[PDB]
Design an enzyme around this catalytic site. Structure first.
Site, PDB file in Angstrom:
ATOM      1  N   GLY A 109       2.836   6.117   8.825  1.00 21.64           N
ATOM      2  CA  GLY A 109       3.991   6.897   8.738  1.00 21.64           C
ATOM      3  C   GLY A 109       4.768   5.911   8.945  1.00 21.64           C
ATOM      4  N   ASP A 143      -0.860  -7.522   1.738  1.00 22.98           N
ATOM      5  CA  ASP A 143      -0.575  -5.819   2.089  1.00 22.98           C
ATOM      6  C   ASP A 143       1.220  -6.247   2.063  1.00 22.98           C
ATOM      7  OD1 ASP A 143       0.061  -3.677   2.238  1.00 22.98           O
ATOM      8  OD2 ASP A 143      -1.021  -3.060   3.587  1.00 22.98           O
ATOM      9  N   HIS A 173       0.628  -1.344  -0.224  1.00 22.63           N
ATOM     10  CA  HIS A 173      -0.351   0.030  -0.631  1.00 22.63           C
ATOM     11  C   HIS A 173       1.019   1.713  -0.033  1.00 22.63           C
ATOM     12  CE1 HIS A 173       0.068   0.457   4.392  1.00 22.63           C
ATOM     13  NE2 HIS A 173       0.141   1.679   4.222  1.00 22.63           N
ATOM     14  N   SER A 191       3.392   2.519   8.276  1.00 19.58           N
ATOM     15  CA  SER A 191       3.191   0.982   7.802  1.00 19.58           C
ATOM     16  C   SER A 191       4.543   0.830   7.060  1.00 19.58           C
ATOM     17  CB  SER A 191       2.220   1.640   6.825  1.00 19.58           C
ATOM     18  OG  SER A 191       1.523   2.544   6.684  1.00 19.58           O
TER      19      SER A 191
HETATM   20  N1  LIG Z   1      -1.990   0.599  14.586  1.00 23.68           N
HETATM   21  C1  LIG Z   1      -2.844   1.585  13.998  1.00 23.68           C
HETATM   22  N2  LIG Z   1      -4.165   1.298  14.865  1.00 23.68           N
HETATM   23  N3  LIG Z   1      -3.832   1.926  12.627  1.00 23.68           N
HETATM   24  C2  LIG Z   1      -2.004   2.212  11.531  1.00 23.68           C
HETATM   25  O1  LIG Z   1      -1.413   1.039  12.027  1.00 23.68           O
HETATM   26  C3  LIG Z   1      -1.792   2.814  10.236  1.00 23.68           C
HETATM   27  N4  LIG Z   1      -2.504   3.817  11.005  1.00 23.68           N
HETATM   28  C4  LIG Z   1      -3.460   4.663  10.099  1.00 23.68           C
HETATM   29  C5  LIG Z   1      -4.142   6.212  10.266  1.00 23.68           C
HETATM   30  C6  LIG Z   1      -5.169   6.295  10.589  1.00 23.68           C
HETATM   31  C7  LIG Z   1      -5.531   7.029  11.092  1.00 23.68           C
HETATM   32  C8  LIG Z   1      -6.329   8.282  11.550  1.00 23.68           C
HETATM   33  F1  LIG Z   1      -7.948   7.597  11.806  1.00 23.68           F
HETATM   34  C9  LIG Z   1      -6.604   9.680  11.597  1.00 23.68           C
HETATM   35  C10 LIG Z   1      -5.454  10.042  11.520  1.00 23.68           C
HETATM   36  C11 LIG Z   1      -3.754   9.239  10.961  1.00 23.68           C
HETATM   37  C12 LIG Z   1      -3.994   8.066  11.055  1.00 23.68           C
HETATM   38  O2  LIG Z   1      -3.583   7.103  10.674  1.00 23.68           O
HETATM   39  C13 LIG Z   1      -2.054   4.694   8.565  1.00 23.68           C
HETATM   40  N5  LIG Z   1      -2.254   5.509   7.404  1.00 23.68           N
HETATM   41  C14 LIG Z   1      -1.825   4.866   5.754  1.00 23.68           C
HETATM   42  C15 LIG Z   1      -2.170   4.210   5.580  1.00 23.68           C
HETATM   43  C16 LIG Z   1      -3.512   4.529   4.748  1.00 23.68           C
HETATM   44  C17 LIG Z   1      -4.101   6.103   4.730  1.00 23.68           C
HETATM   45  C18 LIG Z   1      -4.886   6.364   6.120  1.00 23.68           C
HETATM   46  C19 LIG Z   1      -3.774   6.859   7.208  1.00 23.68           C
HETATM   47  N6  LIG Z   1      -1.884   3.525   8.888  1.00 23.68           N
HETATM   48  C20 LIG Z   1      -1.917   3.077   9.901  1.00 23.68           C
HETATM   49  N7  LIG Z   1      -0.477   1.638   9.146  1.00 23.68           N
END
Ligand SMILES: N=C(N)NC(=O)c1nc(-c2cc3c(F)cccc3o2)c(N2CCCCCC2)nc1N
Length: 245
Positions: free
Chosen positions: A196, A97, A46, A198
């Protein structure tokens, strides 16, 4: 990384920092990765799907800071960007992914292992730790969901593996989570991966060995109650990894 602690590359020497060059020449951080052999970094599809051109990317090994050089670091171009053919994304979840980057320096060299640069072992097939095992995650991702910036210093934290049955609950993720994913979280929902992080490593001690058990993939929000981090289950992709390396 929400919560957790600052660290340096010596505590996670397989950690790869992946950036992309822009038109005009600006360079920005994309995602983490893990060095699994001298020439190969493993990460998440991704991270690259919107700009799938290998020449747009730069990989650093031995780097502890985001926008300043670390002594002893190595910089690589991407000779090979391999995304998983079966990747898909629903609203939240990403399936399959997983991505491989073959790294080559301008001098045509792979990684030379050092104090700041080492490989991480892959798991043996279908062999993960039991639920409730504490594992570690590492990355340059946001420290708070509301942050505009990424931290300048590398971070890590500890999360506990959650059972598939538990992560399956509708309160958690329902059927968004498959057996090719792993869930992990803090019992207080106090620390977590975020935007970030990821592509970076979930590392567990298995059989006395530090093992790349997961790759940061997705979650709903960050460090939210009932919303664990979701990780690509590396032990279910060994043929794909082996074939493509
Ligand atoms: N562990 C976990 N709860 N979330 C993860 O791991 C995670 N979260 C996110 C994630 C969600 C999110 C949110 F609701 C508010 C502010 C910042 C955020 O960041 C994220 N993003 C990169 C990719 C797709 C696009 C979404 C953003 N990537 C992730 N891998």
């Amino acid at each position: 990384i929400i919560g957790g602690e600052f660290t340096t590359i010596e505590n996670q020497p397989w950690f790869a920092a992946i950036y992309r060059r822009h038109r005009g020449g600006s360079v920005t951080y994309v995602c983490g990765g893990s060095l699994i052999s001298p020439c190969w970094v493993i990460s998440a599809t991704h991270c690259f799907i919107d700009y799938p051109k290998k020449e747009d990317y730069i990989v650093y090994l031995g780097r502890s800071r985001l926008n300043s050089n670390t002594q002893g670091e190595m910089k690589f171009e991407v000779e090979n960007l391999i995304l998983h053919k079966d990747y898909s994304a629903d609203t939240l979840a990403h399936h399959n992914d997983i991505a491989l980057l073959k790294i080559r320096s301008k001098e045509g060299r792979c990684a030379q292992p050092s104090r700041t640069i080492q490989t991480i072992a892959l798991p043996s097939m279908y062999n993960d730790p039991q639920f409730g095992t504490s594992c570690e995650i590492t990355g340059f991702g946001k420290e708070q969901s509301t942050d505009y910036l990424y931290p300048e210093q590398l971070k890590m934290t500890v999360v506990k593996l959650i059972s598939h049955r538990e992560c399956q609950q509708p309160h958690y993720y329902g059927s968004e989570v498959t057996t090719k994913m792993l869930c992990a979280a803090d019992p207080q929902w106090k620390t977590d991966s975020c935007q970030g992080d990821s592509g970076g490593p979930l590392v567990c001690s298995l059989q006395g060995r530090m093992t790349l058990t997961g790759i940061v993939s997705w979650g709903r929000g960050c460090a939210l109650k009932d919303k664990p981090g979701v990780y690509t289950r590396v032990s279910h992709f060994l043929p794909w990894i082996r074939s493509h390396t």
